[PDB]
Design an enzyme around this catalytic site. Structure first.
Site, PDB file in Angstrom:
ATOM      1  N   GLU A  35      53.189  62.933  49.774  1.00 45.70           N
ATOM      2  CA  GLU A  35      53.498  61.592  50.266  1.00 45.70           C
ATOM      3  C   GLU A  35      53.774  61.585  51.761  1.00 45.70           C
ATOM      4  OE1 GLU A  35      53.257  58.740  48.825  1.00 45.70           O
ATOM      5  OE2 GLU A  35      53.099  59.236  46.687  1.00 45.70           O
ATOM      6  N   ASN A  46      50.620  49.117  54.022  1.00 45.55           N
ATOM      7  CA  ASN A  46      49.730  48.827  52.906  1.00 45.55           C
ATOM      8  C   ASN A  46      48.915  47.564  53.172  1.00 45.55           C
ATOM      9  OD1 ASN A  46      52.596  49.768  51.040  1.00 45.55           O
ATOM     10  ND2 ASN A  46      50.751  50.999  51.195  1.00 45.55           N
ATOM     11  N   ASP A  48      48.594  44.914  51.410  1.00 47.05           N
ATOM     12  CA  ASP A  48      49.277  43.669  51.077  1.00 47.05           C
ATOM     13  C   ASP A  48      50.355  43.286  52.083  1.00 47.05           C
ATOM     14  OD1 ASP A  48      51.446  45.320  50.570  1.00 47.05           O
ATOM     15  OD2 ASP A  48      51.499  44.958  48.415  1.00 47.05           O
ATOM     16  N   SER A  50      53.037  45.158  52.827  1.00 51.89           N
ATOM     17  CA  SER A  50      54.266  45.910  52.642  1.00 51.89           C
ATOM     18  C   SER A  50      54.121  47.244  53.378  1.00 51.89           C
ATOM     19  CB  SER A  50      54.541  46.118  51.154  1.00 51.89           C
ATOM     20  OG  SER A  50      53.528  46.915  50.577  1.00 51.89           O
ATOM     21  N   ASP A  52      55.460  51.555  53.359  1.00 49.46           N
ATOM     22  CA  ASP A  52      56.091  52.675  52.662  1.00 49.46           C
ATOM     23  C   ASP A  52      56.910  53.538  53.634  1.00 49.46           C
ATOM     24  OD1 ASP A  52      54.723  51.824  50.355  1.00 49.46           O
ATOM     25  OD2 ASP A  52      53.108  53.251  50.675  1.00 49.46           O
ATOM     26  N   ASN A  59      58.393  51.737  48.817  1.00 54.28           N
ATOM     27  CA  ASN A  59      57.684  50.551  49.274  1.00 54.28           C
ATOM     28  C   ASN A  59      58.604  49.343  49.439  1.00 54.28           C
ATOM     29  OD1 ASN A  59      55.999  47.927  48.181  1.00 54.28           O
ATOM     30  ND2 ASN A  59      54.830  49.212  49.597  1.00 54.28           N
ATOM     31  N   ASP A 101      62.487  53.247  35.889  1.00 57.28           N
ATOM     32  CA  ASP A 101      62.102  51.862  35.620  1.00 57.28           C
ATOM     33  C   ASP A 101      61.070  51.726  34.506  1.00 57.28           C
ATOM     34  OD1 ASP A 101      59.581  52.461  36.673  1.00 57.28           O
ATOM     35  OD2 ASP A 101      59.859  51.281  38.502  1.00 57.28           O
TER      36      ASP A 101
END
Ligand SMILES: [Cl-]
Ligand SMILES: [Cl-]
Ligand code: NA
Ligand code: NA
Length: 129
Positions: A35, A46, A48, A50, A52, A59, A101
């Site tokens: 990562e 990203n 969209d 957003s 990271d 994110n 989650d």
């Protein structure tokens, strides 16, 4: 800060990630390698809108607030900049929420594509733990 492999393994172990939700330490070290290349200051934007953040590339659409991701949740209740510290505590505590989650470590695309199903124990081989 750019960690060494064994240095990060030790820090993650002290923060309770070894076998957290059943994921051995090598999984977390492998995910961090691909990562962020072990660099706490890593950021990537990203498509969209957003972004990271940090060693585990958390994110801003769901997990932290960076003031520029409209309609985002801050489910870890932290500014995204806190995830870039040389102290990995905030990244670790938020990662524990993410991995709990429902989807496990599949939330990290690089883990799914480059660590899952491989010999992840190799990432801690040789380290004094
Ligand atoms: Cl392991
Ligand atoms: Cl990937
Ligand atoms: Na090291
Ligand atoms: Na957000």
């Amino acid at each position: 800060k750019v960690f060494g492999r064994c240095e990060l393994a030790a820090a993650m172990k002290r923060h309770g990630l070894d076998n957290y939700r059943g994921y051995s330490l090598g999984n977390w070290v492998c995910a961090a390698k691909f990562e962020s290349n072990f660099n706490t200051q890593a950021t990537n934007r990203n498509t969209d809108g957003s972004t990271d953040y940090g060693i585990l590339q958390i994110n801003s659409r769901w997990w932290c607030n960076d003031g520029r991701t409209p309609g985002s949740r801050n489910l870890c209740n932290i500014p995204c900049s806190a995830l870039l510290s040389s102290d990995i505590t905030a990244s670790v505590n938020c990662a524990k929420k993410i991995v709990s989650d429902g989807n496990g470590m599949n939330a990290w695309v690089a883990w799914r594509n480059r660590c899952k199903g491989t010999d992840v124990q190799a990432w801690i081989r040789g380290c004094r733990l």
